[PDB]
Enzyme design. Structure first.
Site, PDB file in Angstrom:
ATOM      1  N   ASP A  29       0.822  -1.201   0.000  1.00 18.66           N
ATOM      2  CA  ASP A  29       0.000   0.000   0.000  1.00 18.66           C
ATOM      3  C   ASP A  29       0.860   1.257   0.000  1.00 18.66           C
ATOM      4  O   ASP A  29       0.758   2.092  -0.906  1.00 18.66           O
ATOM      5  CB  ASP A  29      -0.935  -0.029   1.209  1.00 18.66           C
ATOM      6  CG  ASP A  29      -1.863   1.156   1.255  1.00 18.66           C
ATOM      7  OD1 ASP A  29      -2.803   1.213   0.436  1.00 18.66           O
ATOM      8  OD2 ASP A  29      -1.656   2.022   2.128  1.00 18.66           O
ATOM      9  N   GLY A  30       1.732   1.393   0.995  1.00 21.61           N
ATOM     10  CA  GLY A  30       2.507   2.618   1.124  1.00 21.61           C
ATOM     11  C   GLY A  30       1.594   3.758   1.520  1.00 21.61           C
ATOM     12  O   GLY A  30       0.814   3.655   2.473  1.00 21.61           O
ATOM     13  N   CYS A  98      10.491  -1.552  -6.537  1.00 16.26           N
ATOM     14  CA  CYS A  98      11.301  -1.692  -7.744  1.00 16.26           C
ATOM     15  C   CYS A  98      12.744  -1.259  -7.523  1.00 16.26           C
ATOM     16  O   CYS A  98      13.353  -0.635  -8.398  1.00 16.26           O
ATOM     17  CB  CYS A  98      10.667  -0.908  -8.889  1.00 16.26           C
ATOM     18  SG  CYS A  98      10.492   0.863  -8.571  1.00 16.26           S
ATOM     19  N   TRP A 269       1.432   5.657  -6.058  1.00 11.65           N
ATOM     20  CA  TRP A 269       0.723   5.600  -7.324  1.00 11.65           C
ATOM     21  C   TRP A 269       0.280   6.994  -7.757  1.00 11.65           C
ATOM     22  O   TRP A 269       0.261   7.947  -6.972  1.00 11.65           O
ATOM     23  CB  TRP A 269      -0.499   4.689  -7.216  1.00 11.65           C
ATOM     24  CG  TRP A 269      -0.182   3.230  -7.172  1.00 11.65           C
ATOM     25  CD1 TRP A 269       1.015   2.641  -7.453  1.00 11.65           C
ATOM     26  CD2 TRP A 269      -1.075   2.169  -6.809  1.00 11.65           C
ATOM     27  NE1 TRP A 269       0.921   1.280  -7.300  1.00 11.65           N
ATOM     28  CE2 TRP A 269      -0.352   0.965  -6.903  1.00 11.65           C
ATOM     29  CE3 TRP A 269      -2.415   2.122  -6.416  1.00 11.65           C
ATOM     30  CZ2 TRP A 269      -0.924  -0.273  -6.619  1.00 11.65           C
ATOM     31  CZ3 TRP A 269      -2.983   0.893  -6.137  1.00 11.65           C
ATOM     32  CH2 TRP A 269      -2.238  -0.289  -6.238  1.00 11.65           C
TER      33      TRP A 269
END
Ligand SMILES: Nc1ncnc2c1ncn2[C@@H]1O[C@H](CSCC[C@H](N)C(=O)O)[C@@H](O)[C@H]1O
EC number: 2.1.1.37
Length: 288
Positions: A29-30, A98, A269
């Site tokens: 989620d972050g 990533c 996001w």
DNA sequence: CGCGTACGTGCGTTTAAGCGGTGCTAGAGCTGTCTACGACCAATTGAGCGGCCTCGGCACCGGGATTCTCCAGGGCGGCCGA
């Protein structure tokens, strides 16, 4: 690139009399972008479960959602028993870190290091939250990753998730330059970017007063992209939230520095891109 | 060791130092007169110096406030590199 071939599973639309709120599992989620987008679209959320490690992101969620988020710790602590005891899920989302998946590192460690292999954790929870055969419940899933990956890495991910990765660039709907791959089975997975007039397309709409945008949009020369009082100044964090589609003053939740807010907003996001992606869920689920 | 600037060299330009003249006069310099100012002599005496004393200003021990020194930690980017 046609290396694999598989039809996307399209679920039948449910009418309004059998309409239910969403149960959402959010693995990496972050910053809680998914539940933010879901609340912005006016969708009733019955249960939201975020498995987040970092305490700053957990603080972002606790401030911006007021205890609605059910927190898990590390994703390795989640078993099949935790999935089957927390009810069947309607939406599974996530984007793996990533650090080693990006090819911008010269000495990258690849998919099978402890930053990349967490994706497989996702797949395991994808295998547990997926309903068995015979169940016609609409189950949806979404994985996010960067564009700067190898051919074999993207090929293996696309084979493991069994979906076509659509490429979405933030410049078509927001004021950021980042292309991201999106695996998933949402309806209209590759439909074009319906730009909303409420979304800030240009950079200057995201700036504050007294600051002039040097570029047309920002990226993800020894200069700075914003002039301020005829002086080059660093791009602000609230302006970065306005670029990334977040509400104004979103990631100011605790006594974290500028570098921590950069580290949180970088990995987050893009709100308009998600809003586009989560848009057709409105006719499959509850509305508020 | 690198940057630069500002000083030295050279040439043309020109300002005035130097030399050579004379005229004049203020003032250095030497001479005579004398007078007033200082050396020389004695008495005297009181101011200045040897001796003494006592006492308070200065030297010194101790304690607390303070006052600058310095290093440890906390936050802070930031810088990468493994
Ligand atoms: N093993 C783990 N399990 C769960 N979360 C983890 C994790 N390791 C790292 N994380 C956190 O999960 C996040 C994945 S990074 C990308 C986050 C995602 N794109 C978003 O929508 O924000 C990071 O912020 C990281 O702090």
């Amino acid at each position: 690139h046609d290396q694999e071939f598989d039809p996307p599973k399209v679920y039948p639309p449910v009418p309004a009399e059998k309409r239910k709120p969403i149960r959402v599992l959010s693995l990496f989620d972050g910053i809680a972008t998914g539940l933010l987008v879901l609340k912005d679209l006016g969708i009733q959320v019955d249960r939201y479960i975020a498995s987040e490690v970092c305490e700053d992101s957990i603080t972002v969620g606790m401030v911006r959602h007021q205890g609605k988020i059910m927190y898990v710790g590390d994703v390795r602590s989640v078993t099949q028993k935790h999935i089957q005891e927390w009810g069947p899920f309607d939406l599974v989302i996530g984007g793996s870190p990533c650090n080693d998946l990006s090819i911008v590192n010269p000495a990258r460690k690849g998919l099978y290091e402890g930053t990349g292999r967490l994706f497989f954790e996702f797949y395991r929870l994808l295998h547990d939250a997926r309903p068995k055969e015979g169940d016609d419940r609409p189950f949806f899933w979404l994985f996010e990753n960067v564009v700067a990956m190898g051919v074999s890495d993207k090929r293996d991910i696309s084979r493991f998730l069994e979906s076509n990765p659509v490429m979405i660039d933030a410049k078509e709907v927001s004021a950021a330059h980042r292309a991201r791959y999106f695996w998933g089975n949402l309806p209209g997975m590759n439909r074009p970017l319906a730009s909303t007039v409420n979304d800030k397309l240009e950079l200057q709409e995201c700036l504050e007063h007294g600051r002039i945008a040097k570029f047309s949009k920002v990226r993800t020369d020894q200069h700075f992209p914003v002039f301020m009082n005829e002086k080059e100044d660093i791009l602000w964090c609230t302006e970065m939230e306005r670029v990334f589609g977040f509400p104004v003053h979103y990631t100011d939740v605790s006594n974290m520095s500028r570098l921590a807010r950069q580290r949180l907003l970088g990995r987050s996001w893009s709100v308009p891109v998600i809003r586009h992606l989560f848009a057709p869920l409105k006719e499959y689920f509850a509305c508020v």
